[PDB]
């Protein structure tokens with residue numbers, strides 16, 4: 001098909017964990033769009049019901065719901081991984097609890113449980129892990145000299161995630177960062193120690209903006225929080241998010257696809273970082289898309305993100321898939337909130 005020399009044959013089955021999630025649903029969408037069959041897991045079939053209906057209508061018989069109530073359970077993937085040529089492990093703890101135990105441990109456990117299943121399944125040749133830019137750093141507004149590459153690790157989050165008092169408003173963020181960081185480190189360590197017969201790549205998105213396919217049963221994650229602002233809600237949690245990088249949900253789906261099928265992408269940490277933004281650029285975009293609508297006034301200046309990311313593999317993947325360059329923030333936000341038109 002489109003993808004020449006794809007490592008996974010046309011129509012191959014890909015297992016996507018936590019398929020009812022926001023980012024995962026976009027990864028599924030892109031896989032289906034490219035002719036691959038997908039078996040997506042969710043803690044309940046009901047959680048995927050609306051998305052199943054969407055995909056059955058758009059991609060008849062290409063998506064299959066698979067129930068995995070406990071992603072940490074021994075043998076959890078024995079049945080659903082059968083025949084899969086690729087695996088995309090996307091599910092992770094996003095409760096933003098300040099409890100290191102309820103976030104970090106399960107994050108690592110879920111990651112290794114999926115990796116072990118893949119290692120035990122000869123048919124699996126490619127594995128893509130959804131990490132995050134927080135596995136490299138927590139944004140530091142107005143700070144110069146920050147360049148993140150594939151060797152950048154958020155080592156400071158591991159210590160802060162358990163040294164910071166619960167009163168620090170960034171506590172849960174550091175715990176989440178430690179969970180992502182330790183989970184990804186564990187994945188690469190597993191690869192180097194066990195040397196399984198599949199290739200691993202990780203996608204590290206920053207703030208993912210895009211269409212929430214199932215508003216009914218999808219909270220939306222990052223995009224859901226942005227939608228709440230669109231609807232006029234200004235939550236303090238929103239203030240716990242500093243200026244950083246955005247990335248289109250469409251592009252994140254494409255990066256996962258590239259990691260699963262492009263031959264030139266192996267053992268890479270692919271940054272999903274299109275450009276910088278802050279809540280005021282978001283509000284500005286809202287006002288541009290809906291000139292007649294009332295929106296909250298600008299937030300106080302929160303500085304700007306002066307960091308830079310090594311996006312070489314990301315750009316290589318996008319170009320190889322025929323969608324070169326990053327989708328703009330205006331188009332990304334429009335994918336989420338639409339525009340004033342008729």
Ligand SMILES: *O[C]1[C]([O])[C]([C]OP([O])(=O)O=P([O])([O])O[C][C]2O[C]([N+]3=[C]C(C([N])=O)=[C][C]=[C]3)[C]([O])[C]2[O])O[C]1N1[C]=NC2=C1N=[C]N=C2[N]
Pocket residue numbers: 017018019020021022023024043070071090091092093094106130131132133180204205206207208209219220221222223
């Ligand atoms: O169930 C659940 C779901 O499926 C998931 C989640 O989803 P949400 O919430 O939507 O979120 P998200 O975001 O999509 O997530 C996914 C992934 O990705 C990542 N990231 C993201 C981003 C943005 N968005 O922007 C960036 C970066 C990165 C994260 O981290 C993750 O990994 O999941 C699931 N879960 C939860 N919890 C749990 C689960 N499963 C199972 N178990 C448990 N515990």
